[PDB]
Amino acid sequence: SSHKTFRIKRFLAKKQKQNRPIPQWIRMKTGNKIRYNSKRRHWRRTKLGL
Amino acid sequence: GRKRPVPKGATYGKPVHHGVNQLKFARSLQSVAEERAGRHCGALRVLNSYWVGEDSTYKFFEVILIDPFHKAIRRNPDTQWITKPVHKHREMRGLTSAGRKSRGLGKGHKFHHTIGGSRRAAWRRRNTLQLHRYR
Amino acid sequence: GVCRKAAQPVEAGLQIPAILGILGGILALLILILLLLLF
Amino acid sequence: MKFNPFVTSDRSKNRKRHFNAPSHIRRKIMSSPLSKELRQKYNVRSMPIRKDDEVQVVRGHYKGQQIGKVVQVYRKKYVIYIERVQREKANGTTVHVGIHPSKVVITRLKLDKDRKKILERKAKSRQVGKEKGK
Amino acid sequence: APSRNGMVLKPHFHKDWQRRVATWFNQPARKIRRRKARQAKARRIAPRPASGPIRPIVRCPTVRYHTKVRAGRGFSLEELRVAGIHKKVARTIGISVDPRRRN
Amino acid sequence: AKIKARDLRGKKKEELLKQLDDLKVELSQLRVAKVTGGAASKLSKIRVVRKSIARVLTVINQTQKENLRKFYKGKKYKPLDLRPKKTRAMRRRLNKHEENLKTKKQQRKERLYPLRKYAVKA
Amino acid sequence: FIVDVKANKHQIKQAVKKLYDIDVAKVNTLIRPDGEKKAYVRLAPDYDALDVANKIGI
Amino acid sequence: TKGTSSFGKRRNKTHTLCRRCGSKAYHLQKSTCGKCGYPAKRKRKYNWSAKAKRRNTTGTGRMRHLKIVYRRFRHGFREGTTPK
Amino acid sequence: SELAGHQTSAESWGTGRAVARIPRVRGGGTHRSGQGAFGNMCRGGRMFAPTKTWRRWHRRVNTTQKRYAICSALAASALPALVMSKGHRIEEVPELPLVVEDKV
RNA sequence: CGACUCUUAGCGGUGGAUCACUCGGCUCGUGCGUCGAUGAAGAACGCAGCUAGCUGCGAGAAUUAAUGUGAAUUGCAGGACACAUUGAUCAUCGACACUUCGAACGCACUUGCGGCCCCGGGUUCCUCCCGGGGCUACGCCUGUCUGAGCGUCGCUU
RNA sequence: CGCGACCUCAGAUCAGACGUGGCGACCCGCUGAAUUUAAGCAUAUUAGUCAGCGGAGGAAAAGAAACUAACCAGGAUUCCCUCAGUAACGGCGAGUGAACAGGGAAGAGCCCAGCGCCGAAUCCCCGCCCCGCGGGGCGCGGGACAUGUGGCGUACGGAAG
RNA sequence: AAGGCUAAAUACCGGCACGAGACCGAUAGUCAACAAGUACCGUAAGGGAAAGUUGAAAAGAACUUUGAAGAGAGAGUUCA
RNA sequence: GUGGAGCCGCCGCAGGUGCAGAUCUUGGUGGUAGUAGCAAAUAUUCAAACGAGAACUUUGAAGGCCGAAGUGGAGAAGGG
Ligand SMILES: [Mg+2]
Ligand SMILES: [Mg+2]
Ligand SMILES: [Mg+2]
Ligand SMILES: [Mg+2]
Ligand SMILES: [Mg+2]
Ligand SMILES: [Mg+2]
Ligand SMILES: [Mg+2]
Ligand SMILES: [Zn+2]
Known part of the structure; x- marks a missing residue:
């Protein structure tokens, strides 16, 4: 908003760090079945709702 | 005695349950x-x-x-x-x-509406279907 | 990445538009044109 | 027949305790038999295999009079790697093809201070089985 | 709903009865739970007799049953008075006492 | 350079905190090695020094809580973290003494009329 | 630097003067949007930064 | 005016996140929460929804302290240390 | 069928709208948002007449028939035609009520 | 002649039925039956060499100590192999520690504003001067201290 | 006018305790429908159930007769089998609906106020010790509680001298 | 009677562990065998999914060649 | 013929027991059909460059538009 409180932007900082693809050294690991981050959020499609 | 806590005395139900004002x-x-x-x-x-x-x-x-x-x-x-x-x-x-x-509760013929423990412990035991294993 | 628009991305999504197609169409009876048939 | 009412017999639950085993239980289920010579010198049947035991493969594609030491013990995949049995890749790189230690016969143990006492504990309990015969 | 010559019947199932249902599946399990509560009560006590104290001769009430003899509750202090034993001594002799009983 | 906690117990408090702040210096300058390009042999050193820094802080806290539990031993009114935890309901039971209490009427009743052992054949 | 988020500028002023043995003129902090606090620590003109940076690694 | 153009004026927020349950149900003017009812001392739960209890009862969090109590029970809640 | 397959909020759409009058699940977003809910036709529905644990599992036999059956099971275990026609290889065996002494 | 159409059959494609599998449910039963002001359940935030989730943890943060165990963890690196030091890993866990909100407790909830007591340095300090420590919620019981009453009364004046 | 005693009350970040909140399958106290059934519908039924609220415990509640009986009389409570779909209730319609004997499972009984007696023979707190582990005391000395009644022996099966 | 205590037999679709089944076999069985009360939806109370399987072992097709690459043609692994 | 690890007959026993329809449920795919459509707010053109590749990128020249209640320059709320 550019006028936001602290508990908003450390909530927003958390959502921004966990929007990242899988590192490519886990596809090589033993017995996983993950092949892409499926909790990825894009800022136009899906919004947090504050 | 208690008044029934209901807005404007309207209980919205069957006519036996219009009891707003004589309740004890x-x-x-x-x-x-x-x-x-x-x-x-x-x-x-x-x-x-x-x-x-x-x-x-x-x-x-x-x-x-x-x-x-x-x-x-x-x-x-x-x-x-x-x-x-x-x-x-x-x-x-x-x-x-x-x-x-x-x-x-109490012992006697005047009190055997509650004959195991309490009133709702009798009701559960008078109304459970006690179907056995060989029946 | 060198293999992230090729081996991360084609897994990443590619079926994410599939939100229901139709969610009912709650537009309340499209026969708004009063017809009423001879009464 | 099982008689204990405190140990399972179901397929779903012994498999679940197999693949989700703790890593110190997992060295016990990756045990290997001693050779006919070496089970007579120690009067013990089988042992858990460790990193530097000399061993030959008794069944598989790679088998038959091939004494050679283990070099790596994958407990996660229940697999030992042995320093001679190998396989060329498509690249030309050579890797260790891995095998299960029940398909394997120890021909020379690696003794330390602890693998003396593991042998003597498994040996002394075997006379007690013979002492039951009165 | 009725038909030819039949019985007029009142099944008392007009009430939500599938919640208040009782199945006796634990009933073999409770028979070996109160045998083990008798065995581990017999060996726990003493050479004192199992199944507790001595009960009296008692006749049943109510015309239908007054020709039979039943085991009772205690020993009705007058009977303890004539036999010569004390009322607070008697229940560690193995003798049941019911003070409200009349002779 | 390994650190064993069994070795650290015979040390002094003026030696432990000197050896602890010594470890905080290496953990400061290894974090610098990660924010630069890197010296990756020193990027696996960071985990074994941050677990070494917990071993010193543990022996400081274990030789202070038990250095102070020996002070309030034999004392009424010891602090709350030294009292036994045991669950909230265990502290509100009576104790093993008060649950043995019998009144004087029920004491003479037990010594005049004790439970006898017997059997019934002859 | 990057500072722990619960530190005010007095604590930063003493925790850089004591670790690195330098006089501190003023500090300007910031919460950069990953969630970590960044501090801009200016030195006294008696000191220099390009050589203090050399002895702290970079 | 009834439909899509009245969605443009939706500009200021009714609920923000609650400090006790983290929900975006803390109404700013009523000063109460939707799910927990925060400035009341007790937790809001009702038997007319069995799913709402399934979301937030015990066993759905870390259980930072009942993990330990469930473990300390099966030894009788010891206080003194082990022998060497 | 544990509690029920009835832990779903669902009403019939009711009116016209060119769908069958089965109940549909509520809400939007998710896949399961306009699909046929409970009733023995639907993916995720509730089975017809869900089995109950108060089915009469156990049967009574009066004791004179239990004793009758065990006398007929012993008299046929001595006739060599009936014991071999159940498959027991008793070709080489001696006398059909095999009796070994109490030392065994 | 070719094309189009139709029906069959081969092959190929689309699609994911069937079958075979199962670290999952479901039912029944047994044994115990244990949260919290000594800060619970729950929530938020953070923690790994490369680490988003899940799982596990709390600035000692992918775990410390102890005991038991006895050579690994492993996707790749790195590192001590030392074990007649102390010994990797894993399990147990009885020792320590356990951010922020929360019954949540200085007051507010705007990371907002304090009050006393103490401690290390600055005015060597009172009258509102940096950091750190401690304490400050309500109801209530027993005891204490302070003391209110043209309440009841005494000794007085 | 002052002081004292007590009696009613205040205050405290006083020394020390306690309570709050969660879970809630089972249990206790309250509160409470309507769909439904009656081929309509009011009483009735659904149902003293659902939802609501409040308290627990590993069990809870009940529990040692102001009982049943009416005869050769049984003898706390709880559970089970029968009684019994019975007596009875009911637009006497739809429907509802116990108990006592009897057979079992388990079995255990007690305390108090009162009335009298004993020089308050009683209890709590603080201080230093007998002497101790893993801390609670009977002993010693002070402050309170308490005669408007602590304690002992006594309980209707009688009790005391 | 208008005061009080009390074990056992009884209850238990939550919890912590167990054991079993003429049960279901991935549109079934828990909503959920999988990063599931998750993604997503709704201002909210709340609604709430889909998604198991290469091989015995990655031995996951080096290399040559066409193409800007996707994509091929040979070769190669493997019982396949 | 494919496939690669289990299966069937008879005698009794037991069912969540056989589908063409329910505007059935769920998933899949057709015909329509290479069709309807890619038509509000006047407008583009030339050369060069970069490029595997230019109606659409950038650059330059031209012609135009918004025309200061702007198609300009800044913010609040909301987004993150
Ligand atoms: Mg019958
Ligand atoms: Mg099983
Ligand atoms: Mg408050
Ligand atoms: Mg499918
Ligand atoms: Mg450790
Ligand atoms: Mg402070
Ligand atoms: Mg409890
Ligand atoms: Zn809330």
Whole structure:
């Protein structure tokens, strides 16, 4: 908003760090079945709702 | 007696249930008195109470209470029954002599609507279908 | 990445538009044109 | 027949305790038999295999009179790697093809201070089985 | 709903009865739970007799049953008075006492 | 350079905190090695020094809580974290002494009329 | 630097003067949007930064 | 005016996140929460929805301290240390 | 069928709208948002007449028939035609009520 | 002649039925039956060499100590192999520690504003001067201290 | 006018305790429908159930007769089998609906106020010790509680001298 | 009678562990065998999914060649 | 013929027991059909460059538009 409180932007900082693809050294690991981050959020499609 | 807590006396149901104004609250007023004494002092244990006056609108009961953690109570094994944690809040469960007069229990032909334990323990046992294993 | 628009991304999504197609169409009876048939 | 009412017999639950085993239980289920010579010198049947035991493969594609030491013990995949049995990749790189230690016969143990006492505990309990025969 | 010559019947199933249902599947399990509560009560006590104290001869009430003899509750202090044993001594002799019983 | 906690117990408090702040210096300058390009042999050193820094803080806290539990031993009114935890309901039971108390009427009753053992054949 | 988020500028002023043995003129902090606090610590003109940075690694 | 153009004026927020349950149900003007009812001392739960209890009862969090109590029970809640 | 397959909020769409009058699940977003809910036709529905644990599992036989059956099971275990026609190889065996002494 | 159409058959494609599998449910039963002011359940935030989730943890943060165990963890690196030091890993867990909100407790909830007591340095300090420590919620019981009353009374004046 | 005693009450970040909140399958106290059934519908039924609220415990509640009986009489409570779909209730319609004997499972009984007696013979707190581990005391000395009644022996099966 | 205590037999679709089944076999069985009360939806109370399987072992197709690459043609692994 | 690890007959026993329809449920795919459509707010053109590749990128020249209640320059709320 550019006028936001602290508990908003450390909530927003958390959502921004966990929007990242899988590192490519886990596809090589033993017995996983993950092949892409499926909790990825894009800022136009899906919004947090504050 | 109690008035039924409903807006403008409209109970919205069958005509037997229009009872806004003649309703009598099946637990006694002394039992109400002991209840909100052991609700204010939640650390104290309640023993029983007695009558010391009534006017026309107010009714005065002396409720006698017990500190369960005073060492004059936690010694003396004739009083150690109430420092045992099943006696916590005896009037919220209706276990004192004021409150148990409304449970309707007692031995006899006049009281066998509650013939196992309580009223709703009899009802569960008169209305369970006790289908056996070989039947 | 060198293999992230090729081996991360083609897994990443590629079926995410599949939100229901139709969610009912709650537009309340499209026969708004009063017809009423001879009464 | 099982008689204990406190141990399972179901397929779903012994498999679940197999693949989700703790890593110190998992060295016990990756045990390997001693050779006919070496089970007579120690009067013990089988042992859990460790990193530097000399061993030959008794069944598989790679088998038959091939004493050679283990070099790596994958407990996660229940697999030992042995320093000679190998396989060229498509690249030309050579890797260790891995095998299960029940398909394997120890021909020379690696003794330390602890693998003396593991042998003596498994040996002394075997006379007690013979002492039951009265 | 009725038909030819039949019984007029009142099944008392007009009430939500599938919640208040009782199945006796634990009933073999409770028979070996109160045998083990008798065995571990027999060996726990003493050479004192199992199944507790001595009960009296008692005749049943109510015309239908007054020709039979039943085991009772205690021993009715007058009977303890004539036999010569004390009322508080008697229940560690193995003798049941019912003070409210009349002779 | 390994650190064993069994070795650290015979040390002094003026030696432990000197050896602890010594370890905080290496953990400061290894974090610098990660924010630069890197010296990756020193990027696996960071985990074994941050677990070494917990071993010193543990022996400081274990030789203070038990250095102080020996002070309030034999004392009424010891602090709350030294009292036994045991669950909230265990502290509100009577104790093993008060649960053995019998009144004097029920004591003479037990010594005049004790439980006898017997059997019934002859 | 990057500072722990519960530190005010007095604590930063003493925790850089004591670790690195330098006089501190003023500090300007910031919460950068990953969630970590960044501090801009200016030195006294008696000191220099390009050589203090050399002895702290970079 | 009834439909899509009245969605443009939706500009200021009714609920923000609650400090006790983290829900975006803390109404700013009523000063109460939707799910927990925060400035009341007790937790809001009702038997007319069995799913709402399934979301937030015990066993759905870390259980930072009942993990330990469930473990300390099966030894009788010891206080003194082990022998060497 | 544990509690029920009835832990779903669902009403019939009712009116026109060119769908069958089965109940549909509520809400939007998710896949399961306009699909046929409970009733023995639907993916995720509730089975017809869900089995109950108070089925009469156990049968009574009066004891004179239990004893009758065990006398007929012993008299046929001595006839060599009936014991071999159940498959027991008793070709080489001696006398059909095999009796070994109490030392065994 | 070719094309189009139709029906069959081969092959190929689309699609994911069937079958075979199962670290999952479901039912029944047994044994115990244990939260919290000594800060619970729950929530938020953070923690790994490369680490988003899940799982596990709390600035000692992908775990410390102890005991038991006895050579690994492993996707790749790195590192001590030392074990007649102390010994990797894993399990047990009885020792320690356990951010922020929360019954949540100085007051507010705006990371907002304090009050006393103490400690290390600055005015060597009172009268509002940096950091750190401690304490400050309500109801209530027993005891204490302070003392209110044209309440009851005494000794007085 | 002052001081004292007591009696009614205040205050405290006083020394020390306690309570709050969660879970809630089972249990206790309250509160409470309507769909439904009656081929309509009011009483009735659904149902004293659902939802609501409050208290627990590993069990809870009940529990040692102001009982049943009516005869050769049984003898606390709880559970089970029968009684019994019975007596009874009911637009006597739809429907509802116990108990006592009897057979079992388990079995255990007690205390108090009162009335009298004993020089308050009683209890709590603080201080230093007998002497101790893993801390609670009987002993010693002070402050209170308490005669408006602590304690002992006594409980209707009688009790005391 | 208008005061009080009390074990056992009884209850238990939550919890912590167990054991079993003429049970279901991935549109079934828990909503959920999988990063499931998750993604997503709704201002909210709340609604709430889909998604198991290469091989015995990655031995997951080096290399040559066409193409800007996707994509091929040979070769190669493997019982396949 | 494919496939690669289990299966069937008879005698009794037991069912969540056989589908063409339910505007059935769920998933899949057709015809329509290479069709309807890619039509509000006047407008583009030339050369060069970069490029595997230019109606659409950038650059330059031209012609135009918004025309100061702007198609300009800043913010609040909301987004993150
Ligand atoms: Mg029958
Ligand atoms: Mg199983
Ligand atoms: Mg408050
Ligand atoms: Mg499918
Ligand atoms: Mg350790
Ligand atoms: Mg402070
Ligand atoms: Mg409890
Ligand atoms: Zn909330």
